Amino acid sequence: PETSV
Amino acid sequence: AGSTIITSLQRKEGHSLGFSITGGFKQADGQYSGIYISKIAKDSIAAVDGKLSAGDILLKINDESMTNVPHSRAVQMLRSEGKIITIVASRQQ
Ligand SMILES: [N+]
Ligand SMILES: [N+]
């Protein structure tokens, strides 16, 4: 999981 | 153990901060893996600020430690802040 913020 | 990178990003209404994070999953030894910056979006607030880099390990958001925490906690802490957010990170050569 890689999450953009 | 690396060098400390510290910056306070100012969110513009309507916009993301401009970077992505990976990590924070539980390992066999019961600790969560580190949270790292995995990309920075071109022309974004984080990119224009310029201090952070992909590969940096996140140490703190404001007063909160990012060591030994789940991914979703780091995501929540980032998404919770609507204006200024202090990011403390570390970077090795
Ligand atoms: N600042
Ligand atoms: N996990």
Side-chain angles (χ1 to χ4, degrees), chain B residues 71-82:
Chain B
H71 186 92
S72 58
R73 175 167 315 148
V75 171
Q76 286 174 24
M77 181 66 163
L78 294 156
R79 287 188 171 161
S80 75
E81 305 296 349

Side-chain angles (χ1 to χ4, degrees), chain B residues 6-9 49 84 86:
Chain B
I6 174 158
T7 197
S8 290
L9 300 183
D49 174 73
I84 302 180
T86 304

